[PDB]
Amino acid sequence: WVRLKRGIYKDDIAQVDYVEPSQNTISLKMIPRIDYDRIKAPPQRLFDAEKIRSLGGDVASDGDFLIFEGNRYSRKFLFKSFAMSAVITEGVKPTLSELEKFR
DNA sequence: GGATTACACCCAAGACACCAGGCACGAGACAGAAAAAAACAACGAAAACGGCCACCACCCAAACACACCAAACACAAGAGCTAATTGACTGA
């Protein structure tokens, strides 16, 4: 488990899904901190594919896969690649709430 | 009553004379000065020994100046006017 440093996902929990051997970027699973392009022209909430398909805009659909604004990849839950220098790989220690979410 | 005038009188010059006190020599011996050996203070030579006393700091108790600091500066009342992040950094 890691936490991103920059962007709109500062100090947000990310589950390390796949470690790419290239030692450049690692695939991370995140909860979308987005408003589905409704007010902007945000808390952590479950990803609503139908909402972003109804609102339209920059969106590409592959059934359970999605590519939307910000070059953001989502599946079923964002699965996006970020550099290890942009995350912290030591000292996250998630709680039971994050286990349910992902002496 | 000092001195004079007059009237008895007893103490001693002088006499020889008795003779043992006194004086000119003589001897056993003795208190003492000449000489010598040994302690001794009078009086000046130092020294120690206090000894007040005038220093050299010594230490604390004001005396005085100065300067820095903080806190104060009458009540009420009405109205209007303006500001209350800010250029800009960095992913995207």
Side-chain angles (χ1 to χ4, degrees):
Chain A
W1 311 65
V2 294
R3 298 178 83 175
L4 196 66
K5 296 177 182 178
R6 288 290 184 265
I8 206 66
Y9 292 166
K10 311 181 280 153
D11 297 335
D12 292 339
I13 300 295
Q15 189 179 9
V16 176
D17 186 74
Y18 184 71
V19 178
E20 288 176 348
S22 69
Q23 291 297 324
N24 278 316
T25 74
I26 307 311
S27 179
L28 308 182
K29 180 184 174 71
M30 291 147 196
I31 304 302
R33 284 211 174 227
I34 58 169
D35 203 38
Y36 298 94
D37 200 74
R38 191 172 181 179
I39 300 169
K40 181 187 179 186
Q44 286 179 350
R45 182 65 65 191
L46 285 176
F47 191 67
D48 200 2
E50 195 71 26
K51 186 175 181 180
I52 203 163
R53 283 193 292 267
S54 177
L55 273 296
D58 307 280
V59 64
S61 182
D62 194 4
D64 287 330
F65 195 67
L66 291 169
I67 304 97
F68 69 98
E69 181 201 54
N71 197 1
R72 307 299 176 183
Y73 292 165
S74 186
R75 182 177 65 247
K76 295 185 186 292
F77 296 103
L78 296 166
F79 288 97
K80 297 185 292 184
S81 63
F82 283 96
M84 73 291 291
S85 64
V87 294
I88 294 170
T89 61
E90 184 181 3
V92 173
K93 291 185 177 183
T95 60
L96 301 169
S97 64
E98 292 299 325
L99 294 178
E100 306 263 339
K101 170 186 276 296
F102 288 107
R103 64 185 182 278

